[PDB]
Amino acid sequence: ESYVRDSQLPTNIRDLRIHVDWKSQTIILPIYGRPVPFHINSYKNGSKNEEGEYTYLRLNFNSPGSSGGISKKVEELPYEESADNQFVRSITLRSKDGDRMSETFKQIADLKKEADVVQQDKLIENKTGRTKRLDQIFVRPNPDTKRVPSTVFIHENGIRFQSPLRTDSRIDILFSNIKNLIFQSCKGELIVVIHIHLKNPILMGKKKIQDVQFYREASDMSVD
Amino acid sequence: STDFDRIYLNQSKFSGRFRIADSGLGWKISTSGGSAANQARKPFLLPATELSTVQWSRGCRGYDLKINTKNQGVIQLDGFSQDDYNLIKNDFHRRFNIQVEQREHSLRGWNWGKTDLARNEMVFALNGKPTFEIPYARINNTNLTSKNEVGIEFNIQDEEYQPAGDELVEMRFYIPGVEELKEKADIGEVAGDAIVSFQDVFFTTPRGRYDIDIYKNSIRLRGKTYEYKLQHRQIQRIVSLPKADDIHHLLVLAIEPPLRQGQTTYPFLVLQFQKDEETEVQLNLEDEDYEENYKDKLKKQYDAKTHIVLSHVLKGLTDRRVIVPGEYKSKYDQCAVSCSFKANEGYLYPLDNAFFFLTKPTLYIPFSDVSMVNISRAGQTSTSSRTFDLEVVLRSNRGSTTFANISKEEQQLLEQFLKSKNLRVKN
């Protein structure tokens, strides 16, 4: 939605220059003297042309033939609510008469861009007699660019990687989400490693990861 | 009654005047004053028998009346303040007795809607919430494709820099595979005609081989694929140039505004002709009328070069001066110089008041607008073979263009031209 009531007016009542709103993630245009708002998620792209003294701005929405390569396909916003219904595809303007248009066009250029995880079940931690713990273990992909040493433990319904050796942060992995656990040793290899491949990727650290691995290094080269 | 001079209408137009009456609404455009003696105005009267509905509210732009009538005109009135609700409603409650609701036709701004072709407008309802109804008075041209894709090309008449304001070219739209329906009612207005025609002429923008004919006050281009219309008022300048080898001639028509298919731009209509195209033409006009029609410039029957004929007819229609190719001889007696651009090789032609760079995109560089030029060169044995570069700046558009691939002789001849023309050569 753009707005919801009359109380929230545009930034200026007399909008004699094409206005771009940022707070409500929408922008208004007058199609010949009377308003309409449209949405960034409803937008595709914009383009420019300058010719002699006249100028032609093109603005393209997200619609069939525009957002999707092939028509009659399945997309979230336009098709899912209604697949056989009228939408708009692109418009144009010529605002040579005022030197305020390139400014709003670059505000378009960044507004188009200015704007995500399946949540697993919480892994229950239990400190039973049978407890798995080994150290100098490094996880990859790491939470941050630097390399994280910590320990790893097995529980009854998932895999837990406890950070408290480094930063006390908690990362949880669901047994059902793990698809394949495989070992690979140091036989001709530079590491000794445990890979868990997941079907439902998890958000951790700074990013979204599917593949999760824990290993120890076997390096022998030295520069001392 | 009451009088205000700051009331707006037709937002791509300057302010107007109102003078309210019991019998009706009298709208006067703001008077045009010539020499402080000639006073021009166009008054219009909208009596009370035409009012149908009022939907004035604060949800739309320019808080002021938004009137729809049975005279097939919509008064999308603008230029009043927030406190005029009580005033206008007190004035209007005497006879009309119509409540103005808080609409706010639509603001959800989501693309999905339904379009219905009204008697004079195109209503766009987002599930019962109207979004747009443009009257058919403001439309200019309509184009349709095989996807039932609709493009409405407009042509607004600019007056001056300041009052022009916002002003739209195109309203485009797609429609799905509607069964046994098409865009019937939209095409129900004027193109507005009664000299000479051509057959199988070769054009470049759009590129193809079609034919062209002239009516009383315009020209129609026809082909097997598209038809185009070009008005004489839009035509700005006519240019004729030769080729390097003399075998081909180029007729360049500078026009404004460009003729577009919705999304392509053709500033300069470039037409190629052959040197052997020497034939005779016939003028479909009366032996006494063609004097007044062509201002005695051309004869009824005449035989000459077809290029010269077409250029002379074009100059006669436009009533403007012609551009003659310069007498400045390039390398090997040639009339132009070739060089690469946008990954494309094209020619440069100097002239009295501008450089013309051909052919994709045809670029004009007028000497008056030219701010300065510079030269860049490297030191190597290969410098003699198409190496030197020339960078020109236009300050009016802040446009810098660099002209690569120039040899020693070409650079020397260009520089000689440049001193003789007395242009500022930076170094």
Swiss-Prot record, chain A:
Phosphoserine modification sites are: 219
Subcellular location per UniProt equals:
Nucleus; Chromosome
Give the family this protein belongs to, as stated in its UniProt record.
Belongs to the peptidase M24 family. SPT16 subfamily.
Q: What is this protein called?
A: FACT complex subunit SPT16
Any one GO CC term of this protein is: chromatin
Q: What does this protein do?
A: Component of the FACT complex, a general chromatin factor that acts to reorganize nucleosomes. The FACT complex is involved in multiple processes that require DNA as a template such as mRNA elongation, DNA replication and DNA repair. During transcription elongation the FACT complex acts as a histone chaperone that both destabilizes and restores nucleosomal structure.
Q: Which gene encodes it?
A: SPT16
UniProt keywords (A-Z) are: Activator, Chromosome, Coiled coil, DNA damage, DNA repair, DNA replication, Nucleus, Phosphoprotein, Repressor, Transcription, Transcription regulation
Q: Name one GO biological process term.
A: DNA-templated DNA replication
Species of origin reads Saccharomyces cerevisiae (strain ATCC 204508 / S288c)
The main location class comes to nucleus
Record's miscellaneous remark: Present with 18500 molecules/cell in log phase SD medium.
Keyword Coiled coil among UniProt keywords: yes
Known partners and oligomeric status: Forms a stable heterodimer with POB3. The SPT16-POB3 dimer weakly associates with multiple molecules of NHP6 (NHP6A or NHP6B) to form the FACT (yFACT or SNP) complex. The FACT complex interacts with the CK2 (casein kinase II) complex subunits CKA1, CKA2, CKB1 and CKB2 and the components of the transcription machinery CHD1, CTR9, PAF1 and CDC73. The FACT complex interacts with the PAF1 complex. Interacts with POL1. Interacts with SAS3. Interacts with YTA7.
Residue runs in coiled coils: 101-120
